Design a protein around this ligand. Structure first.
Ligand SMILES: C=CCn1c(S)nnc1COc1ccc(Cl)cc1
Length: 134
């Protein structure tokens, strides 16, 4: 009974494009790029009241964020950046902006057919990561 409804569930990574180039743009080092690029995460999304939780479980590094839309929070990313994040809903798309060290990256998550498509942008470099229901 909320529009974030169509994101809720357990999702498994099924394709990725350009993720190595995105990670380079972000500043991820060689060994982390290689190990992280292998990972096939499951993404678990839930909602409880105003609080959204997004968990990522993988061979590389389990993560979990909980947040309220529009309200900034601290996040330690899988690659160990300490970032300040704000997530909003813009026309049905969850828009996640991460700021650190004067840099910014945006991760958009949207439902498209039976997929959840994740677009990660750092400057001119975009990676597209497609998830299907587990
Ligand atoms: C950015 C995309 C969000 N995401 C997806 S989709 N799968 N894993 C992640 C978490 O972000 C990472 C950032 C840098 C590295 Cl090295 C590894 C993961």
């Amino acid at each position: 009974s909320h529009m974030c409804d169509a994101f809720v569930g357990t999702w498994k990574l099924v394709s990725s494009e350009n993720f190595d180039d995105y990670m380079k743009e972000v500043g991820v080092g060689f060994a982390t790029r290689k190990v992280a690029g292998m990972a096939k995460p499951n993404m678990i999304i839930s909602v409880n009241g105003d609080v959204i939780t997004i968990k990522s479980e993988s061979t590389f590094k389990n993560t979990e964020i909980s947040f309220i839309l529009g309200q900034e929070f601290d996040e330690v990313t899988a690659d160990d950046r300490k970032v300040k994040s704000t997530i909003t809903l813009d026309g049905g798309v969850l828009v996640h902006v991460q700021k650190w060290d004067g840099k910014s990256t945006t991760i958009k998550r949207k439902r498209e057919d039976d997929k959840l498509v994740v677009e990660c942008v750092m400057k001119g470099v975009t990676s597209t990561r497609v998830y299907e229901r587990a």
